[PDB]
Design an enzyme around this catalytic site. Structure first.
Site, PDB file in Angstrom:
ATOM      1  N   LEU A  33     -35.915  68.468 -22.348  1.00  0.00           N
ATOM      2  CA  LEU A  33     -36.719  67.915 -21.268  1.00  0.00           C
ATOM      3  C   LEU A  33     -36.973  68.922 -20.160  1.00  0.00           C
ATOM      4  O   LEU A  33     -37.989  68.827 -19.461  1.00  0.00           O
ATOM      5  CB  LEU A  33     -36.023  66.679 -20.701  1.00  0.00           C
ATOM      6  CG  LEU A  33     -35.746  65.599 -21.748  1.00  0.00           C
ATOM      7  CD1 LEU A  33     -35.041  64.406 -21.133  1.00  0.00           C
ATOM      8  CD2 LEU A  33     -37.038  65.161 -22.427  1.00  0.00           C
ATOM      9  N   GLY A  34     -36.070  69.881 -19.978  1.00  0.00           N
ATOM     10  CA  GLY A  34     -36.256  70.881 -18.948  1.00  0.00           C
ATOM     11  C   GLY A  34     -35.070  71.806 -18.788  1.00  0.00           C
ATOM     12  O   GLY A  34     -33.979  71.528 -19.291  1.00  0.00           O
ATOM     13  N   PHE A  75     -28.780  75.277 -13.235  1.00  0.00           N
ATOM     14  CA  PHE A  75     -27.546  74.707 -13.761  1.00  0.00           C
ATOM     15  C   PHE A  75     -27.452  74.813 -15.275  1.00  0.00           C
ATOM     16  O   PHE A  75     -26.344  74.766 -15.819  1.00  0.00           O
ATOM     17  CB  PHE A  75     -27.442  73.237 -13.342  1.00  0.00           C
ATOM     18  CG  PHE A  75     -28.525  72.362 -13.925  1.00  0.00           C
ATOM     19  CD1 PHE A  75     -28.429  71.863 -15.221  1.00  0.00           C
ATOM     20  CD2 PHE A  75     -29.651  72.058 -13.183  1.00  0.00           C
ATOM     21  CE1 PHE A  75     -29.433  71.072 -15.750  1.00  0.00           C
ATOM     22  CE2 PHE A  75     -30.653  71.267 -13.708  1.00  0.00           C
ATOM     23  CZ  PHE A  75     -30.544  70.775 -14.992  1.00  0.00           C
ATOM     24  N   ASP A 113     -31.060  68.898  -1.858  1.00  0.00           N
ATOM     25  CA  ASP A 113     -31.949  69.505  -2.849  1.00  0.00           C
ATOM     26  C   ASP A 113     -33.066  68.540  -3.235  1.00  0.00           C
ATOM     27  O   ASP A 113     -33.389  68.349  -4.409  1.00  0.00           O
ATOM     28  CB  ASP A 113     -31.179  69.973  -4.084  1.00  0.00           C
ATOM     29  CG  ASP A 113     -31.978  70.944  -4.939  1.00  0.00           C
ATOM     30  OD1 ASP A 113     -32.596  71.867  -4.361  1.00  0.00           O
ATOM     31  OD2 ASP A 113     -31.979  70.788  -6.180  1.00  0.00           O
TER      32      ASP A 113
HETATM   33  O1  LIG Z   1     -29.215  65.733 -12.526  1.00  0.00           O
HETATM   34  C1  LIG Z   1     -30.298  66.116 -12.966  1.00  0.00           C
HETATM   35  N1  LIG Z   1     -30.973  67.251 -12.567  1.00  0.00           N
HETATM   36  C2  LIG Z   1     -32.127  67.356 -13.266  1.00  0.00           C
HETATM   37  N2  LIG Z   1     -33.006  68.367 -13.093  1.00  0.00           N
HETATM   38  C3  LIG Z   1     -34.280  68.583 -13.804  1.00  0.00           C
HETATM   39  C4  LIG Z   1     -34.967  69.841 -13.256  1.00  0.00           C
HETATM   40  C5  LIG Z   1     -36.287  70.083 -14.005  1.00  0.00           C
HETATM   41  C6  LIG Z   1     -37.209  68.880 -13.811  1.00  0.00           C
HETATM   42  C7  LIG Z   1     -36.535  67.625 -14.365  1.00  0.00           C
HETATM   43  C8  LIG Z   1     -36.245  67.813 -15.854  1.00  0.00           C
HETATM   44  C9  LIG Z   1     -35.324  69.018 -16.046  1.00  0.00           C
HETATM   45  C10 LIG Z   1     -35.999  70.273 -15.493  1.00  0.00           C
HETATM   46  C11 LIG Z   1     -34.005  68.776 -15.300  1.00  0.00           C
HETATM   47  C12 LIG Z   1     -35.217  67.382 -13.615  1.00  0.00           C
HETATM   48  N3  LIG Z   1     -32.306  66.365 -14.132  1.00  0.00           N
HETATM   49  C13 LIG Z   1     -31.197  65.546 -14.000  1.00  0.00           C
HETATM   50  C14 LIG Z   1     -30.910  64.398 -14.644  1.00  0.00           C
HETATM   51  C15 LIG Z   1     -31.726  63.613 -15.568  1.00  0.00           C
HETATM   52  C16 LIG Z   1     -31.352  62.311 -15.931  1.00  0.00           C
HETATM   53  C17 LIG Z   1     -32.132  61.539 -16.781  1.00  0.00           C
HETATM   54  C18 LIG Z   1     -33.319  62.066 -17.294  1.00  0.00           C
HETATM   55  N4  LIG Z   1     -34.211  61.412 -18.154  1.00  0.00           N
HETATM   56  C19 LIG Z   1     -35.208  62.191 -18.423  1.00  0.00           C
HETATM   57  S1  LIG Z   1     -35.198  63.763 -17.695  1.00  0.00           S
HETATM   58  C20 LIG Z   1     -33.694  63.367 -16.936  1.00  0.00           C
HETATM   59  C21 LIG Z   1     -32.913  64.134 -16.090  1.00  0.00           C
END
Ligand SMILES: O=C1NC(N[C@]23C[C@H]4C[C@H](C[C@H](C4)C2)C3)=N/C1=C\c1ccc2ncsc2c1
Length: 321
Positions: free
Chosen positions: A21-22, A26, A142
């Site tokens: 997803l990304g 971290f 943040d």
């Molecule tokens: O604590 C977090 N920090 C982040 N950071 C990011 C930073 C970028 C944009 C987005 C997706 C990635 C890359 C992770 C949130 N995600 C987090 C949690 C999270 C929980 C549930 C969930 N369901 C779909 S995406 C997703 C992300």
């Protein structure tokens, strides 16, 4: 990182990765099938094995465990953690599966702005959520579009058209209690090292809202003194008392900011920026109400700056009331 989170991998003998997803500083977030729970999908945060990020992950689990217990139904829209574990020396936090972050959504729609009615609802939820953090002695520190996330059922995909924008707030590894984490959403008292607390969140929500409304960031700088000159172009001159109090007197000459506006970068802050009100696209009253709220959120002095309890009382939200 790369070695322990590819598609097909199984984590903790039940979470099968199916997508990335990304990626962050971290580490990574992956979407997984939960084989010991009907096949329901989840999101799993994979944290680098570094002392800095493991201490944050451990703190994040402490915060999420408290927020999830104080608010079981997620009325105040903090993402819910299902469990955590260790995987080859990496802390992995399991979450409920959400949809795109607000940043991915704008980005992948060609940086179109959001509709005003969506902005109104999204802003109410961000404010109601971060107020809940503030009522629990917390500062997010943040806040940004990457950390505001839709809940997947809020939109279609083909071209994404957002339908009904229920949002959630994520990433509490930078969160701080009051006992005793930025980019271009950084508040003035942070840049100037005057100390900071929850009011710096209010400033970052204000930077999020203007981005929702324009589709691009209004402080497109990677330099701290240019950021300050931008603030002056968009918002006006910084308060003499804050300028005169910072240890960072490297940016100023007497009470004014040390800046030759006819340098090549001084000309950039004129092209890139202009006073806040002129960024408006209509003169409709609902546009006037939004920018008034934003102007209160972008107040220089953190004591004057509107709190979020008052921001929930702003006329911009009457249309929801
Ligand atoms: O604590 C977090 N920090 C982040 N950071 C990011 C930073 C970028 C944009 C987005 C997706 C990635 C890359 C992770 C949130 N995600 C987090 C949690 C999270 C929980 C549930 C969930 N369901 C779909 S995406 C997703 C992300």
């Amino acid at each position: 990182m790369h070695l322990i989170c590819q598609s097909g991998d199984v984590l903790s003998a039940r979470y099968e990765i199916v997508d990335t997803l990304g990626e962050g500083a971290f580490g990574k977030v992956v979407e997984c099938i939960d084989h010991k729970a009907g096949g329901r999908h989840v999101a799993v945060k994979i944290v680098k094995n570094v002392d800095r990020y493991c201490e944050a992950a451990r703190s994040e689990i402490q915060v999420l465990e408290h927020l999830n217990t104080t608010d079981p139904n997620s009325t105040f829209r903090c993402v819910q953690m299902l469990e955590w574990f260790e995987h080859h020396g990496h802390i992995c936090i399991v979450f409920e599966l959400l949809g795109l972050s607000t940043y991915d959504f704008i980005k992948e729609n060609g940086f179109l702005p959001f509709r005003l009615d969506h902005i109104r609802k999204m802003a109410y939820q961000i404010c109601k959520s971060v107020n809940f953090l503030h009522s629990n002695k917390l500062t997010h520190t943040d806040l940004k579009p990457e950390n505001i996330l839709f809940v997947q059922s809020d939109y279609t995909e083909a071209e994404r058209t957002l339908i009904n924008p229920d949002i959630k707030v994520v990433d509490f590894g930078s969160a701080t209690y009051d006992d005793e984490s930025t980019r271009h959403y950084r508040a003035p008292e942070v840049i100037l090292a005057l100390g900071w607390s929850q009011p710096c969140d209010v400033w970052s929500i204000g930077c999020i809202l203007i981005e929702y409304y324009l589709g691009f960031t209004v402080f497109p700088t990677h330099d701290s003194k240019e950021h300050l000159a931008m603030m002056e172009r968009i918002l006006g001159p910084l308060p003499k008392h804050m300028i005169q109090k910072t240890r960072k007197r490297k940016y100023f000459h007497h009470d004014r900011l040390d800046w030759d506006e006819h340098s090549s970068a001084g000309r950039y802050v004129s092209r890139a920026c202009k006073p806040l009100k002129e960024f408006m696209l209509s003169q409709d009253v609902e546009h006037e109400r939004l920018f008034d709220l934003i102007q209160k959120m972008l107040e220089y002095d953190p004591a004057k700056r509107i709190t979020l309890r008052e921001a929930l009382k702003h006329p911009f939200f009457d249309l929801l009331k």
